Design a protein around this ligand. Sequence first.
Ligand SMILES: *CCC1=C(C)C(=O)N/C1=C\c1[nH]c(/C=C2\N=C(C[C@H]3NC(=O)C([C@H](*)C)=C3C)C(C)=C2CCC(=O)O)c(CCC(=O)O)c1C
Ligand SMILES: *CCC1=C(C)C(=O)N/C1=C\c1[nH]c(/C=C2\N=C(C[C@H]3NC(=O)C([C@H](*)C)=C3C)C(C)=C2CCC(=O)O)c(CCC(=O)O)c1C
Ligand SMILES: *[C@@H](C)[C@H]1/C(=C/C2=NC(=C\c3[nH]c(C[C@H]4NC(=O)C(C=C)=C4C)c(C)c3CCC(=O)O)/C(CCC(=O)O)=C2C)NC(=O)[C@@H]1C
Ligand SMILES: *[C@@H](C)[C@H]1/C(=C/C2=NC(=C\c3[nH]c(C[C@H]4NC(=O)C(C=C)=C4C)c(C)c3CCC(=O)O)/C(CCC(=O)O)=C2C)NC(=O)[C@@H]1C
Ligand SMILES: *[C@@H](C)[C@H]1/C(=C/C2=NC(=C\c3[nH]c(C[C@H]4NC(=O)C(C=C)=C4C)c(C)c3CCC(=O)O)/C(CCC(=O)O)=C2C)NC(=O)[C@@H]1C
Ligand SMILES: *[C@@H](C)[C@H]1/C(=C/C2=NC(=C\c3[nH]c(C[C@H]4NC(=O)C(C=C)=C4C)c(C)c3CCC(=O)O)/C(CCC(=O)O)=C2C)NC(=O)[C@@H]1C
Ligand SMILES: *[C@H](C)[C@H]1/C(=C/C2=NC(=C\c3[nH]c(C[C@H]4NC(=O)C(C=C)=C4C)c(C)c3CCC(=O)O)/C(CCC(=O)O)=C2C)NC(=O)[C@@H]1C
Ligand SMILES: *[C@H](C)[C@H]1/C(=C/C2=NC(=C\c3[nH]c(C[C@H]4NC(=O)C(C=C)=C4C)c(C)c3CCC(=O)O)/C(CCC(=O)O)=C2C)NC(=O)[C@@H]1C
Lengths: 64, 63, 162, 162
Amino acid sequence: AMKKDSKAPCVEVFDERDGCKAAGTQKASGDDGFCVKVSMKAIGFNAAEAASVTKNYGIKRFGA
Amino acid sequence: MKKDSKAPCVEVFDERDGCKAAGTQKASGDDGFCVKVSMKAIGFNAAEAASVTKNYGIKRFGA
Amino acid sequence: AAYVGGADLQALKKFVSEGNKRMDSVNAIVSNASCIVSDSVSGMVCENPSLIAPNGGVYTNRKMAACLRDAEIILRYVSYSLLSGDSSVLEDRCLNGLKETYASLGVPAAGNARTISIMKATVIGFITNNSQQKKLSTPAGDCSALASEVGGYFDKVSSALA
Amino acid sequence: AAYVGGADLQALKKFVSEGNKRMDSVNAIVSNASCIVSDSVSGMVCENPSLIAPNGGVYTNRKMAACLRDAEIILRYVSYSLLSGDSSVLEDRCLNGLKETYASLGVPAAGNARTISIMKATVIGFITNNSQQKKLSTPAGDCSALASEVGGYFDKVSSALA
Ligand SMILES: *CCC1=C(C)C(=O)N/C1=C\c1[nH]c(/C=C2\N=C(C[C@H]3NC(=O)C([C@H](*)C)=C3C)C(C)=C2CCC(=O)O)c(CCC(=O)O)c1C
Ligand SMILES: *CCC1=C(C)C(=O)N/C1=C\c1[nH]c(/C=C2\N=C(C[C@H]3NC(=O)C([C@H](*)C)=C3C)C(C)=C2CCC(=O)O)c(CCC(=O)O)c1C
Ligand SMILES: *[C@@H](C)[C@H]1/C(=C/C2=NC(=C\c3[nH]c(C[C@H]4NC(=O)C(C=C)=C4C)c(C)c3CCC(=O)O)/C(CCC(=O)O)=C2C)NC(=O)[C@@H]1C
Ligand SMILES: *[C@@H](C)[C@H]1/C(=C/C2=NC(=C\c3[nH]c(C[C@H]4NC(=O)C(C=C)=C4C)c(C)c3CCC(=O)O)/C(CCC(=O)O)=C2C)NC(=O)[C@@H]1C
Ligand SMILES: *[C@@H](C)[C@H]1/C(=C/C2=NC(=C\c3[nH]c(C[C@H]4NC(=O)C(C=C)=C4C)c(C)c3CCC(=O)O)/C(CCC(=O)O)=C2C)NC(=O)[C@@H]1C
Ligand SMILES: *[C@@H](C)[C@H]1/C(=C/C2=NC(=C\c3[nH]c(C[C@H]4NC(=O)C(C=C)=C4C)c(C)c3CCC(=O)O)/C(CCC(=O)O)=C2C)NC(=O)[C@@H]1C
Ligand SMILES: *[C@H](C)[C@H]1/C(=C/C2=NC(=C\c3[nH]c(C[C@H]4NC(=O)C(C=C)=C4C)c(C)c3CCC(=O)O)/C(CCC(=O)O)=C2C)NC(=O)[C@@H]1C
Ligand SMILES: *[C@H](C)[C@H]1/C(=C/C2=NC(=C\c3[nH]c(C[C@H]4NC(=O)C(C=C)=C4C)c(C)c3CCC(=O)O)/C(CCC(=O)O)=C2C)NC(=O)[C@@H]1C
């Protein structure tokens, strides 16, 4: 069921084939450079983004 | 400059609409106004790096 | 949190079709989640500016914020559907009962439908590199099958809320 | 972490009209830091694509990432100077030792100069209503003084880094 808890699956894709590693981020086995992270997280309210959409919604952007 | 990527992150709050998050009253005042400043490490963002590498030659924002 | 690399990721890429293109597709959604949601909710408003007039569905930062939140939640469930080639999670934990709750709050189905269709168009535009401010940094090829699959997931959302 | 509110907040702004415009000006930087930085570093490369050819200044994601990071670091110290009306923290914790560190690293000064210059122009644009995709949600009026001030901080950065 939809739990009314604002929780959503947050997926993160990693392609580190250039070899650049950040310290402490090796959380799994492999050395092809690829990883996927999945975790449930709550999605929060963003007063700033809301204020921006409220002022600028009438501006077409991105070449849409 | 300590080579620790830390910078003053300034956050401006304007909650004069009255909508409040529980527990976020950290200073005195009844304005709705607050400025918060903390030193935080600004991190590397490989995604944005990749994007700028690909898309730098697209003029955006009408700039 | 699951971390999926090395041999587990090579396995994942076998129980899903077009593994490498699929991951590029997922990345294209999650990397752009904020602007997809912002541009989609902005477009529902600019087509029906009454939504942001007094006591409309997204008048006041709180209502507008709850909307942007909801669209991001939905988008992320779709992103997870495309990761696994499977919408069971989206159905179970997003869709089931969502119309019931929105009908009680009267979050209008028409503004939702339009926010959903713009998110789909936006996501499909990225996956096909028809997006104009940003292109993906992917090897060139045909991602039409995955574009259609993810459109299908947005369509389950539209159908459930209609 | 410091919190400035009530009377604490009003010793920050000091005088009525300009102080509000200052808070709006600082809000506009931090609320748009990401795109400011992306557009300024993009413009750098735009004007000198050789910065992204082999062994150029921002060739490889690591270097590009480090540059975008630095641009935001700098932008944020500038936002703090504009909040506090003095450059002291920017000088001692951001600029002091910075050019010599760039020298050893091999970060090309010219590129820094143009990132800073575009960052300046972008921030002034927001403050003087010359921004075209996104307007600030402030009462209309003239902020030419706060544009001059923040230009000063950026020119301080330029003078040390160019
Ligand atoms: C994520 C932001 C983005 C980047 C970056 C990029 O390169 N493209 C981006 C977004 C994007 N949007 C669309 C399609 C639409 N966007 C809107 C809303 C805006 N249209 C308005 O009129 C307006 C109010 C004045 C908006 C705000 C709409 C309506 C669409 C069309 C959806 C439809 O029904 O077909 C896309 C799709 C590709 C394109 O450029 O059109 C993308 C990628
Ligand atoms: C946060 C992004 C943004 C929004 C939103 C908005 O409304 N304006 C925004 C950014 C912005 N940029 C500038 C000015 C410049 N941007 C560039 C880089 C781009 N020019 C290119 O040629 C290029 C590659 C093709 C780009 C990438 C440049 C050069 C400028 C001008 C710098 C100068 O010396 O004047 C502004 C300032 C006002 C304006 O729109 O021109 C803003 C607000
Ligand atoms: C209601 C659902 C709103 C909304 C409110 C949020 N505020 C959040 C964090 C936050 N707000 C303040 C300002 C408040 N605290 C004070 O002490 C005073 C002045 C005396 C003010 C006006 C602060 C300081 C903070 C951060 C508190 C801390 O650092 O621990 C918040 C969480 C996200 C965030 O940190 O910005 C929310 C949701 N947000 C909305 O979208 C609606 C309109
Ligand atoms: C070098 C500085 C790069 C860069 C690297 C970063 N990666 C960050 C987070 C991260 N990366 C992975 C993938 C990695 N871990 C694995 O186990 C595997 C293979 C099995 C790989 C390919 C993961 C899982 C994560 C998140 C770890 C977590 O969930 O805690 C990262 C951010 C660290 C931070 O923000 O604190 C960086 C900087 N980023 C760059 O821009 C350059 C090119
Ligand atoms: C719509 C999706 C795009 C399109 C995507 C393509 N990707 C292709 C090959 C490819 N992509 C990756 C990265 C990917 N694999 C992973 O495991 C992960 C992270 C966990 C990611 C982000 C790889 C490694 C590869 C193969 C190695 C390489 O080719 O460099 C591809 C070529 C066909 C194919 O391999 O299936 C395409 C078409 N291309 C487009 O034009 C649209 C916009
Ligand atoms: C240049 C920055 C801008 C612009 C700024 C103006 N703001 C004006 C009035 C105003 N702004 C605020 C919000 C500000 N005060 C705070 O304490 C904080 C902290 C969160 C913030 C975000 C207030 C409270 C006020 C005064 C109330 C009002 O007049 O609505 C303003 C008019 C100055 C005056 O009334 O004498 C300006 C010009 N306006 C522009 O056109 C550019 C884009
Ligand atoms: C934007 C596209 C809509 C708009 C959306 C609003 N939703 C509001 C409250 C709300 N949303 C949900 C579903 C949400 N919670 C979850 O856990 C998940 C999935 C896991 C989802 C997708 C619920 C249960 C609720 C009620 C409780 C809450 O706010 O957390 C909302 C505020 C309505 C109110 O204040 O009663 C809005 C404004 N509004 C629109 O006009 C457009 C069409
Ligand atoms: C972008 C406009 C430039 C670009 C910038 C680069 N900086 C690189 C590494 C780096 N930058 C700093 C200063 C930085 N760290 C801090 O703590 C502070 C201030 C608080 C800031 C301003 C440091 C210490 C470092 C060393 C790496 C680290 O400790 O994180 C960098 C990588 C250089 C390399 O090793 O190849 C770049 C590319 N590069 C450009 O071409 C444009 C003009």
